[PDB]
Ligand binder design. Sequence first.
Ligand SMILES: Cc1cc2nc3c(=O)[nH]c(=O)nc-3n(C[C@H](O)[C@H](O)[C@H](O)COP(=O)(O)OP(=O)(O)OC[C@H]3O[C@@H](n4cnc5c(N)ncnc54)[C@H](O)[C@@H]3O)c2cc1C
Length: 453
Amino acid sequence: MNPKRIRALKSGKQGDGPVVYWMSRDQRAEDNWALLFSRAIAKEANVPVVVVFCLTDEFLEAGIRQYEFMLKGLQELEVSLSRKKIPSFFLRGDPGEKISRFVKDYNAGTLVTDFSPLRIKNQWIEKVISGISIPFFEVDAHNVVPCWEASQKHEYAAHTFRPKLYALLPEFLEEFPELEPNSVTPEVETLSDVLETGVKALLPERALLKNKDPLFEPWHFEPGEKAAKKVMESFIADRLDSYGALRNDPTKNMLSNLSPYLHFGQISSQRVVLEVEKAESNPGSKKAFLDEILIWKEISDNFCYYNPGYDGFESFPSWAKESLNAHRNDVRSHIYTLEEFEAGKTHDPLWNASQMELLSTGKMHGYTRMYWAKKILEWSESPEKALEIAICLNDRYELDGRDPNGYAGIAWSIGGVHDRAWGEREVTGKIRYMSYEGCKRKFDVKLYIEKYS
Ligand SMILES: Cc1cc2nc3c(=O)[nH]c(=O)nc-3n(C[C@H](O)[C@H](O)[C@H](O)COP(=O)(O)OP(=O)(O)OC[C@H]3O[C@@H](n4cnc5c(N)ncnc54)[C@H](O)[C@@H]3O)c2cc1C
């Protein structure tokens, strides 16, 4: 086990109780560096391990589509962790008040959590640190290369972060050891009841159409660790050979569809990369997929980790802030409100059909995710309003929302983060522009619109 994956958040006197794993971002039992590191520490202290998840008060800021997908994967996770004599405890409330209470009530010896560069996770760590006296560690179980190890600063481009990650791949890209079960079983409600009351609280804000029927379709992505692997195997055997040539065509189902499992941590990217590297296929398709799950996925964590204002206008590059400021007073072609963007009531049918795919499936195609956010910048009163509208609609309706990938993907489309300067236009400035005629020359836009009426 590599010691460069674990960081120390607070020193203190070790207790004589079970080692607590505060699971948050990585909700899986297999291939979860934070969970094996909690097991070896407890094996060294002659004590068992205990998994603790917190059902926060911010679950209503999203929708039912994310509340059911996450909880249904935990019901499978609770059954999974029990076979290895690893009990799980699901607390409801503020993590700062619940984790600090569980540590004192259960006489915890060492607290361990997974890594997440989001601001809400740093808020929980600050309150938890102030209420505990036991050692507190964090382990990067989401990236193949630890976020603090791949680079010591913010990388402004993908071509300057690529040789750093690939140079550290031979050391960190490795096979996972088997999770050892607890020697003996050690010494706050059912997840079905917490799902029934939570869905009841989210029902008045459900996404409906005019016929009062729900818009979300839950049969597109089944949640769980078992379903995550079956999607990975189907992509390797059916979709990866044609990925490099059909990844920018939204009319084809050629993407791996692993982001709802990668966001909630139901499948490990290191596990997918290991299966991808050992699969024989198109080298241009393998290179394109690894560039998406290794470079662009972990550079998003690098963005949110080294930029406190990753969701603001101040984190944009200097050339983009100067260009957007010189094109702010430009008369926009159209100005729609957040409700018109949410209901897909724009003059552009491609943007509306893209929004409908987001409303109905919860996972908009990767190429249309570019056109969807850039048109928000073109049809907003300011770049800041375009940031607020894009983030709100992205985090509310996307299954993989509230993730550093979306914040870095939105900052690319509006602020040009990890991009370069293009031809200067009005309103948008030197930000890369995607037109409706350009997408017609790339894929059948009529088929993508007719599919999402
Ligand atoms: C405006 C906008 C909004 C986005 N919204 C989200 C979001 O809410 N949540 C989210 O996790 N990602 C988001 N992305 C990134 C990207 O769209 C998705 O990661 C990708 O589409 C996920 O679907 P997939 O698994 O079928 O893609 P695949 O082609 O199968 O790629 C597999 C994995 O590689 C990673 N990856 C691929 N493309 C990107 C990318 N452009 N950026 C970061 N990682 C990538 C993802 O982890 C992805 O799961 C967004 C990008 C933009 C420009």
